[PDB]
Amino acid sequence: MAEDADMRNELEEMQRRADQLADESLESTRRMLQLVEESK
Amino acid sequence: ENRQSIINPDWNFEKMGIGGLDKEFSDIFRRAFASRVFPPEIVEQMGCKHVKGILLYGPPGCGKTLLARQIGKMLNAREPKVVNGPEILNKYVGESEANIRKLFADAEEEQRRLGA
Amino acid sequence: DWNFEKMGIGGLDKEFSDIFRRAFASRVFPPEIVEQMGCKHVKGILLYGPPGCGKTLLARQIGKMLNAREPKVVNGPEILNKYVGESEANIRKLFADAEEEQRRLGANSGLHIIIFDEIDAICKQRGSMAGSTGVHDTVVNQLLSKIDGVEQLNNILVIGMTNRPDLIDEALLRPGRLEVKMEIGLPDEKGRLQILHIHTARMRGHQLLSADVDIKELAVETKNFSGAELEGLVRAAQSTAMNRHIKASTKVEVDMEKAESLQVTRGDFLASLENDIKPAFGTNQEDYASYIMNGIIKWGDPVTRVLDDGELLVQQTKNSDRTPLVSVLLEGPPHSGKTALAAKIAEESNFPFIKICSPDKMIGFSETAKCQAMKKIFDDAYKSQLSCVVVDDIERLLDYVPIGPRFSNLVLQALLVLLKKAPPQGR
Amino acid sequence: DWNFEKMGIGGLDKEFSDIFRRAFASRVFPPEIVEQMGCKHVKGILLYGPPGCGKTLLARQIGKMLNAREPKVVNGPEILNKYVGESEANIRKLFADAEEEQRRLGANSGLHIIIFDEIDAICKQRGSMAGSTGVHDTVVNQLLSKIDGVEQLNNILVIGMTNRPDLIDEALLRPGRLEVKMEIGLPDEKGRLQILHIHTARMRGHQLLSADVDIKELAVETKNFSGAELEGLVRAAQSTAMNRHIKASTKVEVDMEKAESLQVTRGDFLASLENDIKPAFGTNQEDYASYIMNGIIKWGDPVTRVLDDGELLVQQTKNSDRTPLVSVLLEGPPHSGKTALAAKIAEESNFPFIKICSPDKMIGFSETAKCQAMKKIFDDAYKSQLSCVVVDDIERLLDYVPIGPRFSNLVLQALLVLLKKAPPQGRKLLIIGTTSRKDVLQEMEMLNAFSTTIHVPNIATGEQLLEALELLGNFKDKERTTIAQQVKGKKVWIGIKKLLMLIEMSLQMDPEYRVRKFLALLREEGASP
Ligand SMILES: Nc1ncnc2c1ncn2[C@@H]1O[C@H](COP(=O)(O)OP(=O)(O)OP(=O)(O)O)[C@@H](O)[C@H]1O
Ligand SMILES: Nc1ncnc2c1ncn2[C@@H]1O[C@H](COP(=O)(O)OP(=O)(O)OP(=O)(O)O)[C@@H](O)[C@H]1O
Ligand SMILES: Nc1ncnc2c1ncn2[C@@H]1O[C@H](COP(=O)(O)OP(=O)(O)OP(=O)(O)O)[C@@H](O)[C@H]1O
Ligand SMILES: Nc1ncnc2c1ncn2[C@@H]1O[C@H](COP(=O)(O)OP(=O)(O)OP(=O)(O)O)[C@@H](O)[C@H]1O
Ligand SMILES: Nc1ncnc2c1ncn2[C@@H]1O[C@H](COP(=O)(O)OP(=O)(O)O)[C@@H](O)[C@H]1O
């Protein structure tokens, strides 16, 4: 019979999710809370 | 725990829904599944394997599949994996074997997890 | 905790002795002497033979005899893939651990075993262009380069099993690669006795085997049996003995009074030996009831001459050394009863391999199919110390028709070449 | 600290001398003169030959001889990927360290060796019919454009090895890319002696080898053995001598008392020769045991005449220089024993390579397969310094049948062309052929090709028949006298094979009727020319 030679492939990526800024925001906010508590 | 309860709690033959075969079933029962109902002690002492399949041939329309399903429903087995011959073939290299190799997966897995 | 008596193999003393001598002799002598010789270790084995004679059993018993780590396995053509350059990745993935350990440890590493299976499905001869030039000439070059390449390995062992030892490549069978070739064949009397003694050991220990059964009158009545069929015979006897106690038709019910007094008796072996198992290199009783349909009535002298001549021709091929191959032709007018007498002559010879090659099982075939069928029967006839092949109604095999004339030439040439080819030595 | 005796290669002096001269002669002369000449450096080597003759060993030893980096290696198709444009990314990463040391260090860089392997798997020819595939035809273009392109590299060296030099692309073998081409072939007696010394030196060093083993006899007794099979023979002998001390009955234990007297004796070598190793371009006694079934007995004068004629033909083909190809035909009536004589004449030749092309291995083949099989036997025969090939039972090779007649016309034309093709310069060949129907061969114009003819008769006198009977030693004195009285006054015409069959047939009656049955059988088997 006729056996297919094989195949070849193509690719199409997608955006990544770093989600790393929120960590810096959370650290900053905790510092906010610490200073706010001390001031009182 | 003795695995003598492979036989379903209640079973009659004629009530199964099959009529016309009475020596085929007798010979099949004697030659094939006489070692799946005897108490495990004697079977273990004698140390014999079990029959690993059978072949059925005849005209088309005489009730072959019915008997296979009844055999399966006899032994408290799981749901049979019905397959068709010309539905396995494929045109690319390494596809037909992949189809044929995907039926023995669950058996191997459950052999791993609970041996014997 | 390894001793040969527990390996569970019988009838293969010479094969295993030779394999041990050639493959494992130099891995058990003290390292100092071996290092004072500078020799490599053999790197392969090949096993071939007819179906069901103990190849995979031997491989499985070797795999667990050594103190290596667990063996790899390749269940046939499970390395193939459709995408370009994905089969060779699966081939390269097998030797990785051996390479890593050789690089790290050195000359102290342990054995790594790879057990191929049905090797003829992926290693066919290269250069058969227009048949295979992709994914079958780049799955052999990779294997050749990996087994013995520019980087040296000394801690692998490869095993292959195949029923067709002619298709495999040639550059893959030279000293330095798969190079220990054995043949597994039908056993002689002692082999059958050993197999029977192996397969009825547990039953005899617990006193479940009657004292009536004899295992020296059963090795004489099973000729040209292979191991699988002896195992099946024993199992059939056990099943027939077990079912004799269950007395229930509607709903399964088990007796207990006689269930304690369970035993296997000669009757079970006799009943199963002639009704359940049918060997593939042996006689058959149905043919001599489908060809000799109304018997041989003696209507005069001309009927007690053919049989005497057949007797003389039968006795010559059994007690001679300068004539291992004989032939004879039965001819006469039509409707004269020729095939019946040939069947009778074959039947009354007591040979252990009798076969009939008739032309009513080849309705609609072409020339090449007929050639292949006849060749297959004759090939099967070369693995038995005695044989008798019947070839009836030649003119139907040739497809003769007086108009023309017209017939088949290829079948005629095959038939004319198969009539003077001698069998292997001693048969 | 390099020294040729260290490499451990034997039988390849000329090849290595040529390789060294061509490739490494311009990297050792003083730089000033090599600059004045103004010549570039060679950047390629190709090795081809039959399996097991020392190709990979040569490449490895060349790799270990140079004061350079660690050579790369590419085990066959190891540069393939399933994505688009990835099969060539791995072809540009090999030459990526040699292009960086040429820009910076100028003309003081060092050799960068690269070692391909099984090159005929990723470098097959490109088609001009638009029948490309993709796995190649983009790899080949990149490789070609990288070995010699617009910008110049002068500090690389590429080595390739293959078994089938036909398929390699032509544009890749011009004197600019792979300029040196070498064929590694089977050795002669000196090569085998050198190989055996190389492989036995270590054992001989530690008084482990016996005193009655002599290497010259083994060198003489192994004809057309390749490089690997001598090593296999030595290893098998060592394995036997080592196993002599191991017991594997119940448990495996080593006898330490007798293990100090380990020694290897020539009995092990002889056993290994007989049982274990079987060459590929040699001969084994199985064929002469399957064709000469019952030996040869001198029942008369003509046998000696036939054998003498064979001897003369052999000597002519061995000593002459104008005629490097001679062939002869044996013919006669059927059942006269003309295939044992050809085998005996070939066996007594003492040539290194002997083959028997018989139609016992070609049952069911279509004519194309028969042609190709014959061509592959002759091609194998064209790679030895002396050879002998036997074409057996010609009439069955053409598929002849009196009706019609009918036969194959595509196999009769690959024989008339293959009986007049001289071998490559400097070698010899002898072809023998046996047939039973000379006239049919004469109608096809096939007796022009053959150089001469020999004739084999049948027993044709009572004295000869009685001599044959006495030689076989079946019938005794009284029976012999009876047969003599019953046959001496007549004429006989019977082949030897039929005589054996008749004797075996008549030895089955009871002891008081054998002679009568034999005479009755012989009477019917009577004819005349
Ligand atoms: N020599 C033997 N000794 C003991 N048992 C044997 C022997 N030969 C066969 N058997 C029994 O029969 C079975 C035959 O299976 P085995 O794996 O040997 O088949 P095989 O030769 O690989 O078959 P095939 O290649 O045709 O599929 C063995 O598992 C074992 O149960
Ligand atoms: N003495 C006998 N010899 C042979 N056959 C006999 C004899 N007595 C009865 N028969 C029966 O006669 C039939 C023999 O016919 P058979 O099958 O040999 O035909 P045939 O010669 O092959 O025929 P055809 O040449 O027409 O194909 C069989 O049924 C055989 O049982
Ligand atoms: N001239 C030689 N001297 C010593 N040993 C040799 C020689 N030629 C071959 N050998 C032996 O051959 C072994 C390996 O052979 P090699 O790697 O050259 O095979 P090859 O023919 O190039 O490979 P393949 O046929 O598999 O493509 C070496 O280990 C060495 O034992
Ligand atoms: N002097 C002899 N010459 C030839 N063969 C002999 C002689 N003495 C004994 N033989 C034996 O006789 C047999 C000769 O038969 P051979 O195979 O040569 O037949 P053939 O001539 O090829 O016949 P065919 O016509 O069937 O092709 C061989 O067994 C050979 O060993
Ligand atoms: N022995 C039997 N008794 C009752 N019904 C039967 C029997 N054999 C076949 N049938 C009928 O045939 C049908 C199924 O046939 P099927 O099993 O598909 O035949 P096949 O196996 O040849 O394809 C059912 O509807 C069933 O009623």
3-state secondary structure D456-507: CCCECCHHHHHHHHHHHCCCCHHHHHHHHHHHCCCCCCECHHHHHHHHHHHC
Report residue D69 as tokens. Answer: 């980096």
Nearest to D123 by CA among D60, D79, D184, D167: D167
If you count them, how many residues does chain D have?
529
Nearest to C282 by CA among C181, C350, C195: C350
Nearest to D53 by CA among D164, D162, D182, D184: D184
The CA distance from D238 to C39, in Å, is 9
Question: What is the position in ligand 4's atom list of the atom closest to the CA of C322?
Answer: 29
If you count them, how many residues does chain A have?
40
Look up tokens 């130099």; give the residue.
Answer: C26
Check residue D406 and report its DSSP letter. B
Nearest to D111 by CA among D101, D96, D121, D126: D101
Nearest to C243 by CA among B69, B19, B48, B78: B48
Whether residue D118 contacts residue D73, with contact meaning beta carbons closer than 8 Å, is answered with: no
The CA distance from D357 to D365, in Å, is 14
Helix (H) or strand (E) holding D305: helix D302-319
Nearest to D279 by CA among D352, D346, D345, D216: D352
Q: Tell me the torsion sign for CA atoms C223, C229, C235, C237.
A: negative
In the beta sheet, which residues pair with residue D459? D494
D268 catalytic? Reply is no
Helix (H) or strand (E) holding D149: none
Report residue B66 as tokens. Answer: 């019915």
Nearest to C39 by CA among D238, D201, D196: D238
Report residue B94 as tokens. Answer: 């390494």
CB distance C140 to ligand 1 below 6 Å: no
Report residue C143 as tokens. Answer: 């294997």
Asked, as a colleague might, if the bond just before D77 is cis with ω within 30 of 0, I would say no
The CA distance from D242 to C39, in Å, is 12
Question: For residue C398, how far is its CA from the centre of ligand 2 (angstroms)?
Answer: 22
In the beta sheet, which residues pair with residue D254? D246
> Entry resolution in angstroms?
3.5
Q: Is C89 on the interface with A (CB under 8 A)?
A: no
Nearest to C329 by CA among C207, C399, C415: C415
The CA distance from D219 to D194, in Å, is 9
Q: Other C-beta atoms within 10 Å of B4: how many?
A: 14
Largest Cα–Cα separation, chain B: 50
Amino acid identity of residue D225, one-letter, is F
Amino acid identity of residue B38, one-letter, is F
Q: Other C-beta atoms within 10 Å of C68: how many?
A: 14
Q: Other C-beta atoms within 10 Å of B1: how many?
A: 5
The CA distance from B13 to B21, in Å, is 10
Neighbouring residues of D129: CB distance < 8 A, sequence distance ≥ 6: none
D338 catalytic? Reply is yes
Collapsing DSSP states into helix, strand and coil, what is residue D144?
A: helix
Chain A positions touching C137 (Cβ under 8 A) are none
3-state secondary structure D191-223: HHHHHHHHHHHHHHHCCCECCCCCHHHHHHHCC
In the beta sheet, which residues pair with residue D382? none
Neighbouring residues of D518: CB distance < 8 A, sequence distance ≥ 6: D475, D483, D502, D503, D506
Q: Is A3 on the interface with B (CB under 8 A)?
A: yes
Collapsing DSSP states into helix, strand and coil, what is residue C91?
A: helix
Supply φ then ψ for residue D389, to 5 degrees.
Answer: -130, 140
Q: Kindly write down the DSSP assignment for every residue of C328-382, as one continuous string.
A: -----STTS--HHHHHHHHHTT--S-EEEE-GGG-TT--HHHHHHHHHHHHHHTT
Neighbouring residues of D441: CB distance < 8 A, sequence distance ≥ 6: D394, D395, D435, D447
Please report, to the nearest 10 degrees, the dihedral formed by the alpha carbons of residues D98, D101, D102, D106 taken in order.
-150
Nearest to D525 by CA among D297, D517, C306, D463: D517
Whether residue C162 contacts residue C168, with contact meaning beta carbons closer than 8 Å, is answered with: yes
D318 catalytic? Reply is no
What are the start-end ranges of the E strands in D59-179?
Answer: 72-73, 112-115, 156-162
Buried-state track C392-412, b at ≥16 Cβ within 10 A, e below 16: beeeebbeeeeeeeebbbbbb
Please name the method used to determine this structure: cryo-EM
Report residue D407 as tokens. Answer: 């036969």
Residues D120, D137, D138, D339: which is the catalytic one?
Answer: D339
Whether residue D106 contacts residue D154, with contact meaning beta carbons closer than 8 Å, is answered with: no
Whether residue D353 contacts residue D281, with contact meaning beta carbons closer than 8 Å, is answered with: yes
How would you classify the pairing of strands D452-455 and D156-162?
unpaired
Neighbouring residues of B74: CB distance < 8 A, sequence distance ≥ 6: B7, B8, B11, B33
Breaks, C-N > 2.5 A, in chain D lie after none
Nearest to D186 by CA among D228, D236, D217: D228
In the beta sheet, which residues pair with residue D73? D115
The CA distance from D64 to B75, in Å, is 68
The CA distance from C238 to C209, in Å, is 10
The CA distance from D221 to D215, in Å, is 10
User: Measured between alpha carbons, how far is residue D112 from residues C406, D66, D73, D145, D156 in Å?
Assistant: 71, 10, 12, 18, 5
In the beta sheet, which residues pair with residue D25? none
User: Measured between alpha carbons, how far is residue C40 from residues C152, C154, D231, D235 in Å?
Assistant: 10, 7, 10, 8
Supply φ then ψ for residue C420, to 5 degrees.
Answer: -135, 30
* C214 exposure class (CB count in 10 Å sphere: 0-12, 13-18, 19+): exposed
Question: For residue D291, how far is its CA from the centre of ligand 4 (angstroms)?
Answer: 9
Q: Kindly write down the DSSP assignment for every residue of C204-233, as one continuous string.
A: HHTT-B-SS--SSSSSSS--S--HHHHHHH
The CA distance from D210 to D263, in Å, is 6
The CA distance from D347 to C186, in Å, is 35
Q: Is C409 on the interface with D (CB under 8 A)?
A: yes
Amino acid identity of residue D381, one-letter, is A
Report residue D227 as tokens. Answer: 């490089």
Whether residue D139 contacts residue D87, with contact meaning beta carbons closer than 8 Å, is answered with: yes
Neighbouring residues of C113: CB distance < 8 A, sequence distance ≥ 6: C63, C66, C68, C71, C72, C156, C157, C159
User: Measured between alpha carbons, how far is residue C194 from residues C187, C201, D30, D255 in Å?
Assistant: 10, 11, 78, 30
Nearest to D488 by CA among D459, D464, D515, D524: D464
Cα R_g (chain D), whole angstroms:
32
Q: Is A6 on the interface with B (CB under 8 A)?
A: yes
Q: Other C-beta atoms within 10 Å of D384: how many?
A: 21
Would you say D160 is a known binding-site residue?
no
Q: Is D82 on the interface with A (CB under 8 A)?
A: yes
If you count them, how many residues does chain C have?
427
**B–D contact (≥3 CB pairs within 8 Å)?**
no
Report residue D165 as tokens. Answer: 């030099």
Amino acid identity of residue B76, one-letter, is N
Sheet holding D429-435, edge to edge: D353-357, D387-391, D429-435, D325-331, D452-455
The ligand placed nearest to the CA atom of residue C147 is 3
Collapsing DSSP states into helix, strand and coil, what is residue D109?
A: coil
If you count them, how many residues does chain B have?
116
In the beta sheet, which residues pair with residue D434? D330
Whether residue C43 contacts residue C177, with contact meaning beta carbons closer than 8 Å, is answered with: yes
Report residue C194 as tokens. Answer: 């050993």
Which positions of C make up the binding site for Mg(2+)?
A: 339
Chain C positions touching D250 (Cβ under 8 A) are 3-5
The CA distance from D429 to D421, in Å, is 10
Collapsing DSSP states into helix, strand and coil, what is residue D181?
A: strand
Whether residue D177 contacts residue D43, with contact meaning beta carbons closer than 8 Å, is answered with: yes
Check residue D401 and report its DSSP letter. B
The CA distance from C353 to C384, in Å, is 7
Mutate to test the interface with D, among C145, C370, C415 (most CBs of D within 10 A): C145
The CA distance from D193 to D217, in Å, is 10
Asked, as a colleague might, if the bond just before C77 is cis with ω within 30 of 0, I would say no
Question: For residue D500, how far is its CA from the centre of ligand 4 (angstroms)?
Answer: 10
Q: Other C-beta atoms within 10 Å of C322: how many?
A: 11
The CA distance from C387 to C403, in Å, is 38
Q: Is D476 on the interface with C (CB under 8 A)?
A: no
Collapsing DSSP states into helix, strand and coil, what is residue B105?
A: helix
The CA distance from D339 to D347, in Å, is 12
Neighbouring residues of A39: CB distance < 8 A, sequence distance ≥ 6: none
**C–B contact (≥3 CB pairs within 8 Å)?**
yes
The CA distance from D470 to D464, in Å, is 10
Chain A positions touching B92 (Cβ under 8 A) are 4, 6-7
Intra-chain end-to-end CA distance of chain B, in Å? 13
Helix (H) or strand (E) holding D394: helix D394-397
In the beta sheet, which residues pair with residue D493? none
* D146 exposure class (CB count in 10 Å sphere: 0-12, 13-18, 19+): middle
Whether residue C218 contacts residue C248, with contact meaning beta carbons closer than 8 Å, is answered with: no
Report residue C303 as tokens. Answer: 């009927």
Calculate the CA C67 to chain-centre distance.
30
The CA distance from C403 to C209, in Å, is 69
Report residue D478 as tokens. Answer: 């009284």
Q: Other C-beta atoms within 10 Å of D288: how many?
A: 16
Chain A positions touching D85 (Cβ under 8 A) are none
Breaks, C-N > 2.5 A, in chain C lie after none
Distance in Å, alpha carbon of D363 to nearest chain A alpha carbon: 25
CB distance C336 to ligand 2 below 6 Å: yes
Which chains have 3 or more CB–CB distances shorter than 8 Å to chain A?
A: B, C, D
D393 catalytic? Reply is yes
Collapsing DSSP states into helix, strand and coil, what is residue C22?
A: helix
Which chains have 3 or more CB–CB distances shorter than 8 Å to chain D?
A: A, C
The CA distance from D26 to D3, in Å, is 19
Neighbouring residues of C405: CB distance < 8 A, sequence distance ≥ 6: D403
The CA distance from D125 to A28, in Å, is 66
Report residue D61 as tokens. Answer: 């030893």
